[PDB]
Amino acid sequence: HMHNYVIIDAFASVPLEGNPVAVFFDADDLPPAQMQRIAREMNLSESTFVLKPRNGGDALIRIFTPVNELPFAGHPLLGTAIALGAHTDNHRLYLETQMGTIAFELERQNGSVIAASMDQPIPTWTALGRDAELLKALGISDSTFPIEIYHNGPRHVFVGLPSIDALSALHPDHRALSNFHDMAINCFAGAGRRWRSRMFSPAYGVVEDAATGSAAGPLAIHLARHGQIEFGQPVEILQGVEIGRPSLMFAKAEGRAEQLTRVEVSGNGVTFGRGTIVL
Amino acid sequence: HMHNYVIIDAFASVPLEGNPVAVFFDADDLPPAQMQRIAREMNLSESTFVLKPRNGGDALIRIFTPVNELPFAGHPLLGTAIALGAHTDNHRLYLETQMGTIAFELERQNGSVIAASMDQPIPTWTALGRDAELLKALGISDSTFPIEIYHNGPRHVFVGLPSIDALSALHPDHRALSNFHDMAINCFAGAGRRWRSRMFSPAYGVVEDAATGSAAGPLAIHLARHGQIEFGQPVEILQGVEIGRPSLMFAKAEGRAEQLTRVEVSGNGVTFGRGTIVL
Ligand SMILES: Nc1ccc(-c2cccc(O)c2)cc1C(=O)O
Ligand SMILES: Nc1ccc(-c2cccc(O)c2)cc1C(=O)O
């Protein structure tokens, strides 16, 4: 009959920062075709729907862009966990997805969930093998570190820049980037614990994304493989600064490249708005 | 501190049809930079903001896409008038805009505004002069009626198809259409009182629009000039069918081409959702 929803800015503690997701509660009465139409109506990068669990978790989450269902997504699931924290006292939340059950640790102050940490799927990776084409599209001559593409659901390519100022100076040819299908292009720069990122993806319908949570785990692996951090070291990844949606993602990859045991991504989230829809 | 909003599906009587707009009430405390950030957060084609009047109208409306402020827009203003009807008993609403005050007639049943009619700016027009390029981009050999571009704020080009089935069969090259700057491409077909339309606009950030209210007045003028209806005859324009967002627009242009006295566009609207934001 009606559904309540909230809009969460994921990877932010301040509204209008981070990356929005709409979260719809009590969605068991909605067929998937209707969920898809609602996600299209909202037009946010994703809308999620909270359903009763089917495999022993706390809830089953379905994730929709305006056009299609996704089996996994980073900031939408973080935002969903933070939104659901308003309706449970549990310290941990087990959210079922198409790719299995993901564990979230919820962080509260006086009953309000302000942040969460999630396990992520362990990615696979290989060289992209299209370096000259991609570098030309980005407008630069070379990457710092190897140009590799990671898969954890989505696909994420990483191109390294020699300084944060060089990262901010990028002005990619988005028409040229559109020849890179079913992937996002993540450009990064930094040192030690602190990194900056920018993400561009014609394939995923975004000129430049504010906070690409599914890329944060892969970036931690990339930095560790290429000697910039150790495995097991947390990194801070600040994305979206140039577009006015600063987003802070934290990530850690445990183990070694050949035997990764855990990939964790965490961030703050904040409620931008709350409402009810008429169906 | 907080603001209430509603989501109106304009040019529809059923939720999830028509074309959405978010309408924010009591917006006088928001600087325009903040309105723009809110419109970006919502990511709907437009968000509007209701302000105290400055020139004797009932309210001043500011209209924002996710990227810029607009001086005029069709479905966003229709939706705003319908939303505001919930907060007044007045039969007519005078909404100030950057382009002057627009009169709306509100249609109610038991206190609920179900539809409205608006005056529109009187357009100007000329031949586009890029016919072969545009026809190639649309994938067809010729137009029925002259390919003319109308200006009433936005710019709207009209290309005529020989049947509704031919209109539905269009599969434009959106890359090629992106060479048409600061305009929308409206393709139409029909007869008598009943017409079908499809609108494509890379320039305005929409692959295909559900209901292009600012094009409805121009189309009525185009059809009258080219002998398909008379001036003063209302037409029904059904848009958005192929994309699953059917939208019914009504339009009438009074006078003659050389001396147009009124351009009226009307439609239903319906509330999809209601909420509150935290700033
Ligand atoms: N914003 C997104 C858009 C698309 C995807 C995605 C694409 C292909 C396969 C797949 O499993 C996920 C992910 C995200 C995300 O936020 O992670
Ligand atoms: N959805 C829209 C997007 C852009 C415009 C527009 C563009 C340039 C100048 C201008 O005055 C208005 C109008 C609409 C509309 O709905 O009418």
UniProtKB/Swiss-Prot annotation, chains A, B:
The active site is at residue 46. One of its GO terms (cellular component) is cytoplasm. GO terms for biological process: phenazine biosynthetic process. It comes from the Bacteria. The keyword Amino-acid biosynthesis does not apply. Homodimer. Coiled coil: none annotated. Keywords: Antibiotic biosynthesis, Isomerase, Virulence. Belongs to the PhzF family. This is Trans-2,3-dihydro-3-hydroxyanthranilate isomerase. The keyword Isomerase applies.
